[PDB]
Paper text:
[name] acts as a 3′-to-5′ exonuclease in the cytoplasm and the nucleus, and has multiple roles in cells (1–3). [name] is a member of the DEDDh exonuclease family and adopts a general two-metal ion mechanism for catalysis similar to other members.
The structure of the [name]–uridine complex is determined for further elucidation of the role of 2′-OH, and the Kd of [name] with various nucleosides and deoxynucleosides is measured using ITF. The residues involved in interacting with uridine and 2′-OH are identical to those in nucleotides. The structural alignment of uridine and UMP also reveals similar positions in the active site of [name], with the main difference being that the general base His195 is closer to uridine.
Numbering used by the authors:
A (entry chain C): 10 to 166, 175 to 234
B (entry chain D): 10 to 168, 175 to 234
């Protein structure tokens, strides 16, 4: 039984072929009680659920070592030059120390939830952490891809991009697409669609983050 | 010249008389360039500005050592019982580590900005940090009270309540959202501080004082 779900989103300099680097990271830590007490979804469509009162949130912009592709910069609204002029620092040991302290405030066991995590966010995060001297702060942490989760939840009762799912469930467009915090809030909203069912799915398919292979070396 | 403004709000178990303890804390770190490149406020009323794209955010719920007053739990929507059952940790050394590493990512010098901060947020934070073995992570950090800031700005602008909501409604003709939540109040404060960013930064540089000179509320 996971006690904490940590909704995660990364934005980066480009697509996996590009050997991308992280430009923004958001973590939203929600205790399982706070999630499973999100009210049922009635109506077609139901209203967009309200986030739980009690949450822990960390959102950071990160200077990459290489430029964002024009396309990445258009959709994320971020660029290496603007990140550097505002003094953003690299993905370095102090950041790992920060994440470690943030994670240690969460009850265990703890599971990251990210949309397309299995093929982007998690392997990329593994790569950024591998470059550090610091031992990984995520080794004891679990992770799941919300795509597989929502596929299993919908067929228990067609695109699976974040926006497609949110639109299909609430008949509205998400807000603040491809911003780390905005995407995390959209994912939380989707996961509050059937919190108990999702939580049971997570408990069954969560896997240790230490088993995730890096995106590149 | 302050290079980073860190908008800060604390919620707690009650008023200073009751020797309160922190229950929620939000920091919103904004580089000075992101603030002064906010679109110039025009129109009457102007729209509530968008937050700058580039920000660092940290919001945390904290288990207090004492229960909240009836009123405090009502306005904040928090209670010691609910924070505990959701596993929230107390104001401890690990939190001080988190704060230290967060501040270290911001360009220096860095200034805290909190509404009524001189009479509540800053002295209470100093009291919480003083209970810890850890040397204060705020020793090299500055702080200002946005009440003084907004008063000074409106006195120069125009040769009356200064509560957060009264200012926000006067500037924008709408009520704030999510009052007495840590992140909600920080977002409200940022919006009123984006009213006149250049003049605000000028006032902050003139009046930023070391957090080390802040007297603890109690203890
Ligand atoms: O159409 C898209 C979607 C995503 N990405 C890259 O993938 C990252 C994660 O979504 C983005 O920040 C961006 O770098 C693109 O380049 N194009
Ligand atoms: O009417 C009020 C205003 C503030 N507070 C206390 O002051 C904190 C914010 O200043 C709140 O979280 C609460 O603890 C009250 O108890 N009552
Ligand atoms: Mg994503
Ligand atoms: Mg306040």
């Amino acid at each position: 039984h996971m006690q904490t779900l940590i909704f995660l989103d990364l934005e980066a300099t480009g697509l996996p072929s590009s050997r991308p680097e992280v430009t923004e990271l958001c973590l939203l830590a929600v205790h399982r009680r706070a999630l499973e007490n999100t009210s049922i979804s009635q109506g077609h469509p139901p209203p967009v659920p309200r986030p739980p009162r009690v949450v822990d949130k960390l959102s950071l912009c990160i200077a990459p070592g290489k430029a964002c592709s024009p396309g990445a910069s258009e959709i994320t609204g971020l660029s290496k030059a603007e990140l550097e002029v505002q003094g953003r620092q690299r993905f370095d040991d102090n950041l790992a120390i920060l994440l470690r302290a943030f994670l240690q405030r969460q009850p265990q066991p703890c599971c990251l939830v990210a949309h397309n995590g299995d093929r982007y966010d998690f392997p990329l995060l593994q790569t950024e952490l591998a470059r550090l001297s610091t031992p990984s702060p995520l080794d004891g942490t679990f992770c799941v891809d919300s795509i597989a989760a929502l596929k299993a939840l919908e067929q228990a009762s067609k695109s699976y991009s974040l926006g497609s799912i949110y639109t299909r469930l609430y008949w509205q467009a998400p807000t603040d697409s491809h911003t780390a915090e905005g995407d995390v809030l959209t994912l939380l909203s989707i996961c509050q669609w059937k919190p108990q069912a999702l939580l049971q799915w997570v408990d069954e398919h969560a896997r240790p983050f230490s088993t995730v292979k890096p995106m590149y070396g």
